[PDB]
Amino acid sequence: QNATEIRASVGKMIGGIGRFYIQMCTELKLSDYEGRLIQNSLTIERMVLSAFDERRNKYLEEHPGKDPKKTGGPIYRRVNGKWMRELILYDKEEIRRIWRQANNGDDATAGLTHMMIWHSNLNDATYQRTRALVRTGMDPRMCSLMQGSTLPRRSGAAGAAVKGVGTMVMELVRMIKRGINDRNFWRGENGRKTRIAYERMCNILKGKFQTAAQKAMMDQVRESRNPGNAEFEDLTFLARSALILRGSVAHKSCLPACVYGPAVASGYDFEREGYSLVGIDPFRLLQNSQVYSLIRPNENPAHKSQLVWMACHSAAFEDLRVLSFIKGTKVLPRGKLSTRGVQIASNENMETMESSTLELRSRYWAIRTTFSVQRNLPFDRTTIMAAFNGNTEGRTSDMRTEIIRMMESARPEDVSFQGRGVFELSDEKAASPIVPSFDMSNEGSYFFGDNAEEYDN
Ligand SMILES: CC1(C)COC[C@@H](COc2ccc(-c3cc(C(N)=O)c(=O)[nH]c3C(F)(F)F)cc2)O1
């Protein structure tokens, strides 16, 4: 009745990204293979984010030097059965024109934030944030709550939804620490700018807490005259609790522009048909898509396929035992994958590069959430140790005790799988659910035994 209009307005955003991609592939003379190459997709997506960014670190993060009226990056072409790389400079003004023209005159800011969230999801599936966490005095075992930690510095409410409790705590703790070392960080006009940002992040984090006590604790943090060690400890205590008492963090399955493009190219009317990020739409679209990736001489194609599959599905922070059943193949922790990131650095030799057909399909599909068969997944060892770390006698409170009690009663109950079950892709209505069978021999976390590169660029 109303949800019909939300699907159409979402489909219109998807449609405009695809119209944009086709126009860029055409402008760049990219072949069908080249346009489906995910490295080409990333550069094109970064160029449009860059054109509207105006060096504000709102849509993307970049390094200053070069012409501010131009923008660009690597475009990969196939010449004589071999891969080559060129750095192109495209006028920012013309990129904006092509974007708005593809979005039938609209600025379509939502289209940009959807590409930005796809970039954040790829980084959450690729890079480790352990050193970043230890640099802020946080426990490196908070890794499972770092949703959207690579989002641009001044990204708005668009990124707020996809940020984790650990990301919110990291950003809030970084502010509290700056003011502890330097009390002048809260004085003057810069202080006024920062206090407004402090209170907004506190309310954004508070919104993710699903209990009265967790939220009431965030009230004390937001309304503290001069944030310090007391607020640092309350924030890390709350991050420890969010390991047992799960917050409400949105995981949006945003796909690359090289997926939406061919769908619009072959006549899909996303505005008319509608599009929902939740449910079968991303799954069904990934079954009717073909994406290529540049592969390094030492990489396993199945492992590069899993990294991109997990990034498309905003699933780096999901239980691998669940992911494995839905995908119909074992999803390995990052430490067990023989692959690096999708992006190719300029110091890399292109003569060694090859290409691979990414296997982005799934056996089943599922929705992100009368009588159920109680199917539980034990909490990961590292998350139990991290959650029950801090001392009860250290800093006392009434809200602290109630959260401790809530954690102590949730722990034996373990992690309950939510939903009717998984569904066949042919079952588009979701009427025949399948009984999920989980393997407890495999670990639950994607970050267990993690050997990934640290995010820096
Ligand atoms: C902690 C517990 C055990 C609690 O019970 C639920 C369970 C996770 O269950 C899921 C997780 C993810 C999806 C999912 C959904 C979408 C979507 N668009 O709806 C997608 O694109 N990709 C996926 C993905 F598999 F790939 F991750 C569906 C169901 O975790």
Between CA 276 and CA 274 the distance in angstroms is: 7
Burial 106-143 (b: 16+ CB within 10 A, else e): eebebbbbbbbbbbbbbbbbbbbbbebbeebebbbbbb
Between CA 454 and CA 457 the distance in angstroms is: 9
- Beta strands in 275-320, from DSSP E residues, in sequence order: 292-295
The reply to whether 276 sits in an annotated binding site is no
Q: How many CB atoms lie within 10 A of CB 283?
A: 21
Ligand 1 proximal residues by C-beta, below 6 Å: 253, 277-279, 282, 313, 315, 318-319, 322-323, 326, 366-369, 377, 415, 417-418
Q: Which of 281, 285, 280 is nearest to 263 (CA)?
A: 285
Q: Return the best residue to mutate from 252, 277, 368, 372 for the ligand 1 pocket (most ligand atoms within 8 A of CB).
A: 368
- Take residue 282 and report the two structure tokens written for it: 């991303």
CA 149 vs CA 14, 119, 146, 444: distances in Å: 24, 11, 5, 21
Q: For the chain, what is the largest distance between any 2 Cα atoms, rounded to a whole number of angstroms?
A: 70
Between CA 11 and CA 24 the distance in angstroms is: 20
Ligand 1 centroid to 304 CA: how many Å? 20
Ligand 1 centroid to 254 CA: how many Å? 14
Contact 358, 305 (CB under 8 A): yes
Q: Return the best residue to mutate from 318, 374, 376, 415 for the ligand 1 pocket (most ligand atoms within 8 A of CB).
A: 318
Residue 329: Cβ-neighbour burial (10 angstroms; 0-12, 13-18, 19+): middle
Atom in ligand 1 nearest the alpha carbon of residue 377: 3
Which residue type, as a one-letter code, is found at position 64?
Answer: P
Contact 48, 92 (CB under 8 A): no
DSSP code at position 422: B
Of all protein residues, the one whose alpha carbon is nearest to atom 21 of ligand 1 is 313
Look at residue 336 and give its three-state secondary structure.
helix
Can you give the length of the chain in residues? Answer: 457
Between CA 222 and CA 231 the distance in angstroms is: 9
- How many helices (H) does the chain have, and how many strands (E)? 18, 10
Between CA 381 and CA 378 the distance in angstroms is: 9
Atom in ligand 1 nearest the alpha carbon of residue 310: 26
DSSP code at position 69: T
The reply to whether 124 sits in an annotated binding site is yes
Of all protein residues, the one whose alpha carbon is nearest to atom 26 of ligand 1 is 313
Going by C-beta distance under 8 Å and a sequence separation of 6 or more, which residues neighbour residue 197?
175
Q: Which of 53, 48, 18 is nearest to 256 (CA)?
A: 18
- Take residue 431 and report the two structure tokens written for it: 């009427």
Contact 28, 88 (CB under 8 A): yes
Between CA 94 and CA 77 the distance in angstroms is: 22
**Resolution attained, angstroms:** 2.2
Ligand 1 centroid to 318 CA: how many Å? 7
Burial 355-372 (b: 16+ CB within 10 A, else e): bbebbbbbebbbebeeee
Atom in ligand 1 nearest the alpha carbon of residue 417: 5
Of all protein residues, the one whose alpha carbon is nearest to atom 10 of ligand 1 is 368
Between CA 104 and CA 264 the distance in angstroms is: 14
Going by C-beta distance under 8 Å and a sequence separation of 6 or more, which residues neighbour residue 268?
15, 18
Of all protein residues, the one whose alpha carbon is nearest to atom 24 of ligand 1 is 313
Of all protein residues, the one whose alpha carbon is nearest to atom 22 of ligand 1 is 313
CA 166 vs CA 138, 156, 173, 260, 420: distances in Å: 9, 18, 10, 31, 29
Ligand 1 centroid to 422 CA: how many Å? 9
Q: Return the best residue to mutate from 118, 249, 313 for the ligand 1 pocket (most ligand atoms within 8 A of CB).
A: 313
Q: Which of 126, 128, 93, 117 is nearest to 13 (CA)?
A: 117
Tell me the backbone φ, ψ of residue 358, rounded to 5 degrees.
Answer: -70, 130
- Take residue 193 and report the two structure tokens written for it: 């700018």
Which residue type, as a one-letter code, is found at position 394?
Answer: G
Between CA 255 and CA 268 the distance in angstroms is: 16
Rounded to 5°, angle at Cα 13 from 8 and 17: 140
Q: Which of 362, 377, 371 is nearest to 443 (CA)?
A: 377
Helices (H), 313-448: 320-327, 381-387, 398-410
CA 297 vs CA 81, 210, 309, 338, 355: distances in Å: 16, 46, 20, 11, 10
Q: Which residue has the tokens 């070392």?
A: 181
DSSP code at position 77: E
Between CA 67 and CA 85 the distance in angstroms is: 21
Ligand 1 centroid to 315 CA: how many Å? 7
First to last CA, the chain: 45
Between CA 117 and CA 253 the distance in angstroms is: 9
Contact 238, 218 (CB under 8 A): yes
